[PDB]
Amino acid sequence: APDTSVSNKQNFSTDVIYQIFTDRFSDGNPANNPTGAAFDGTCTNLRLYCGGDWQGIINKINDGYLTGMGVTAIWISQPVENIYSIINYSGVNNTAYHGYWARDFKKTNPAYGTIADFQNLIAAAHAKNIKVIIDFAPNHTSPASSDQPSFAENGRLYDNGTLLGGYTNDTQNLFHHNGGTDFSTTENGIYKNLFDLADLNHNNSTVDVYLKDAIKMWLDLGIDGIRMDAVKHMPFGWQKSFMAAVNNYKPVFTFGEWFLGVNEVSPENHKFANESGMSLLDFRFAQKVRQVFRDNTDNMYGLKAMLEGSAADYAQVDDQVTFIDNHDMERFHASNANRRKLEQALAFTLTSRGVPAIYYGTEQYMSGGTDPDNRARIPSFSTSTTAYQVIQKLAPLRKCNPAIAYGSTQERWINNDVLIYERKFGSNVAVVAVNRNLNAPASISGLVTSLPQGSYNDVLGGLLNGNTLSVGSGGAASNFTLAAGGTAVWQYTAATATPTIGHVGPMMAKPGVTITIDGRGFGSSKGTVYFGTTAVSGADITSWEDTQIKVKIPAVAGGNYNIKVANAAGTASNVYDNFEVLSGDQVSVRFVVNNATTALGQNVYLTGSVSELGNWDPAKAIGPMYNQVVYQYPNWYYDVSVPAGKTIEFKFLKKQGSTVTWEGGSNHTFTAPSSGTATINVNWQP
Numbered sequence: 001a002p003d004t005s006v007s008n009k010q011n012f013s014t015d016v017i018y019q020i021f022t023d024r025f026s027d028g029n030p031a032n033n034p035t036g037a038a039f040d041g042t043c044t045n046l047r048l049y050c051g052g053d054w055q056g057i058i059n060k061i062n063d064g065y066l067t068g069m070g071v072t073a074i075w076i077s078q079p080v081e082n083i084y085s086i087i088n089y090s091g092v093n094n095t096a097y098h099g100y101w102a103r104d105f106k107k108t109n110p111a112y113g114t115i116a117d118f119q120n121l122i123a124a125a126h127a128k129n130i131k132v133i134i135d136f137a138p139n140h141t142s143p144a145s146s147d148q149p150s151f152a153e154n155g156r157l158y159d160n161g162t163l164l165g166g167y168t169n170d171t172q173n174l175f176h177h178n179g180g181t182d183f184s185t186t187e188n189g190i191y192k193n194l195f196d197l198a199d200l201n202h203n204n205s206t207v208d209v210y211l212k213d214a215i216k217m218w219l220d221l222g223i224d225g226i227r228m229d230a231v232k233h234m235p236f237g238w239q240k241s242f243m244a245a246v247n248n249y250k251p252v253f254t255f256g257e258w259f260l261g262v263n264e265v266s267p268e269n270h271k272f273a274n275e276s277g278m279s280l281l282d283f284r285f286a287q288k289v290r291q292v293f294r295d296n297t298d299n300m301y302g303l304k305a306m307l308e309g310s311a312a313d314y315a316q317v318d319d320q321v322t323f324i325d326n327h328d329m330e331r332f333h334a335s336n337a338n339r340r341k342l343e344q345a346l347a348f349t350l351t352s353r354g355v356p357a358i359y360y361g362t363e364q365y366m367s368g369g370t371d372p373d374n375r376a377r378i379p380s381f382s383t384s385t386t387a388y389q390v391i392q393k394l395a396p397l398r399k400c401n402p403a404i405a406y407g408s409t410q411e412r413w414i415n416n417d418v419l420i421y422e423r424k425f426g427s428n429v430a431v432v433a434v435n436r437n438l439n440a441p442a443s444i445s446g447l448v449t450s451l452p453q454g455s456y457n458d459v460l461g462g463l464l465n466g467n468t469l470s471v472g473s474g475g476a477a478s479n480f481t482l483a484a485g486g487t488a489v490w491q492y493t494a495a496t497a498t499p500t501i502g503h504v505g506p507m508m509a510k511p512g513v514t515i516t517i518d519g520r521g522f523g524s525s526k527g528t529v530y531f532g533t534t535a536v537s538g539a540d541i542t543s544w545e546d547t548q549i550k551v552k553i554p555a556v557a558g559g560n561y562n563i564k565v566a567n568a569a570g571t572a573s574n575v576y577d578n579f580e581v582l583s584g585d586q587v588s589v590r591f592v593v594n595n596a597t598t599a600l601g602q603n604v605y606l607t608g609s610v611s612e613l614g615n616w617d618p619a620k621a622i623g624p625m626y627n628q629v630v631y632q633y634p635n636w637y638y639d640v641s642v643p644a645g646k647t648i649e650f651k652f653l654k655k656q657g658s659t660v661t662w663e664g665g666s667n668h669t670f671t672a673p674s675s676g677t678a679t680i681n682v683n684w685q686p
């Protein structure tokens, strides 16, 4: 199939995600609605179950609501079985209507449906070329109290009906008992409870194996993607090993939730997105968008900075999932605000780089503050709104104009309130003009683009006061007036002659695994794929077409490679980098070093004989290690994803800037488990 097919579980860049809060979407089967104090069919009590289910989704899929919008993928609430208890938080009743309070990852939430229902959902969806994404929260179970076992469900963890353990009297050590996080440090938010949620201990073999087994179940059920919840609260090392378990099995586009605040930029966040094996929800983008289009706390210059910065900070910017709001923040639209604001932010998002995600109800101008006010039942399924039409008109572009899905971003005109940017990919161009100023029009002159000479009509058809663009020689646009609150979309598509790689996924895996190379101009005849200098042709290339190539990762040494392709004619393509070839299946191992004294600003790192350990290159050392929660200075610890059943050589090092101090004596050794986890405790050697 082509890069745009619904069958492409490795690339969402051409899709549009519709984020759905199952319980608040549609109740297609009242028979499964919870009862008693846990229910509220009127949906007036936002903390109770309203009755939204999978059947409801199916109907909305079949009735044309989603399809008519141009939506090509859905992200639904965590499908697994949640606690049943009604939690009372200071007189206020609470339910697991959100599906984040897991009790059994191997079962479904009865309120949502049965495995059969789930299966129907996938079928219905696929039948309509819609990809299905599920939310997954392996960080914790549910709210608990070690002292009050009677509270809630004690965060009990069940394995397909079989009780694994609870928060109280946790002799097996399935959970963390270090209190709750204060969000002070990263380490802090990792080995501590998220609020009152029972924090799972991934260092525990039981938990580790269980979790990996569970995801496999869902994979087998045909999901197309995964939304990892609270990745900022789980050991990065473990997560990597989790991604491998996925990628080496049945790879699917995965992106985690690393919450970022206003004006907040995190290097850790960048590093994670670039080396975890999963991408992230583009909070930086979202926050900036709100500032500029919603709260007016920043201008176009800020927007531009964000675009260029992000394009440089993220190895795979096109994999980041963009948005303007979510179930965790105030709804974009304010009951009293000018709608055009929301429409504009929409257009911008839909035409920008990354994977666009729309929170259900947006197209309906839904307003609401923080949780749960931001999760009201969708008031209506009207296709008549302006927002609905914007999406309808812009969504499809991601599928027909590669510039939008894979193109680069370049500012072509800018001022306080105006922004004209260009997306480019091969022989395809897209130009977007935006005037956030709701009262003043702008005079645009000096606009230069990559568009060929000609006349371009606004893709929005004047829906947002857009206009026709006149391009002369040298891509120079004629002088024009950009209406107040104006938004226009112009584009040019054309056949691409030379092979151009637009996307790759998965980005991390072991040899043998088939990867998907998407782009244009690959030719119809099998060419050659390059993993560094290694050539791959023939059989190993399972499928080859103009827009897509499916190839098996050659058995090369574990490491980071650059991917390149050549058409049958010998023409080489651009280079896609940052490809990680694992040394094999992975396991999560905890490294502990004792008596590693250091000075302020000086941290400890880990290095060793495998690519997963940087191969002795201090510049690729693992760390800085931790020393607050689980273990305390001068003791250091860290969870690392290493090759299973491999005899590894390692040493620790002290780093201050780029200055490194090696551990003395001879290398340490150990053989990685074949499955599950392990803990390696050693003493720092002088």
Ligand SMILES: OC[C@H]1O[C@H](O[C@H]2[C@H](O)[C@@H](O)[C@@H](O[C@H]3[C@H](O)[C@@H](O)[C@@H](O[C@H]4[C@H](O)[C@@H](O)[C@@H](O[C@H]5[C@H](O)[C@@H](O)[C@@H](O)O[C@@H]5CO)O[C@@H]4CO)O[C@@H]3CO)O[C@@H]2CO)[C@H](O)[C@@H](O)[C@@H]1O
Residues within 6 Å of the ligand: 184, 185, 186, 597, 598, 599, 600, 601, 602, 603, 627, 628, 633
């Ligand atoms: O977000 C987490 C945290 O991470 C990073 O901090 C880490 C440090 O980079 C790293 O050096 C390590 O810190 C150790 C330190 O190496 C060790 O020596 C010890 O530190 C002592 C000082 O030795 C001691 O003199 C005293 O410090 C004085 C300091 O002399 C004076 O100049 C002035 O700064 O006041 C200080 C008062 O504290 O106290 C400390 C504590 O005994 O212990 C440290 C660990 O406890 O590990 C850090 C992470 O744990 C970031 O750099 C940091 O901003 C982040 O908060």
Ligand SMILES: OC[C@H]1O[C@H](O[C@H]2[C@H](O)[C@@H](O)[C@@H](O[C@H]3[C@H](O)[C@@H](O)[C@@H](O)O[C@@H]3CO)O[C@@H]2CO)[C@H](O)[C@@H](O)[C@@H]1O
Residues within 6 Å of the ligand: 616, 651, 662, 663, 664, 667
């Ligand atoms: O590639 C050649 C070389 O690589 C490997 O050697 C590594 C060592 O095993 C490893 O300890 C580390 O060596 C550092 C010492 O531990 C430290 O005391 C100090 O001497 O710096 C050394 C690093 O420069 O790194 C090297 C690789 O750089 C392999 O084990 C060797 O057999 C092989 O000769």
Ligand SMILES: OC[C@H]1O[C@H](O[C@H]2[C@H](O)[C@@H](O)[C@@H](O)O[C@@H]2CO)[C@H](O)[C@@H](O)[C@@H]1O
Residues within 6 Å of the ligand: 411, 412, 413, 414, 415, 445, 446, 447, 448
């Ligand atoms: O003509 C090329 C020139 O166009 C853009 O500059 C705009 C500028 O952003 C506006 O604020 C205003 O000053 O008009 C200029 C064009 O005359 C690009 O921003 C700039 O890089 C480019 O050279």
Ligand SMILES: [Ca+2]
Residues within 6 Å of the ligand: 027, 028, 029, 030, 031, 032, 033, 051, 052, 053, 111
């Ligand atoms: Ca129902």
Ligand SMILES: [Ca+2]
Residues within 6 Å of the ligand: 139, 189, 190, 191, 192, 199, 200, 233, 234, 235
């Ligand atoms: Ca945790």
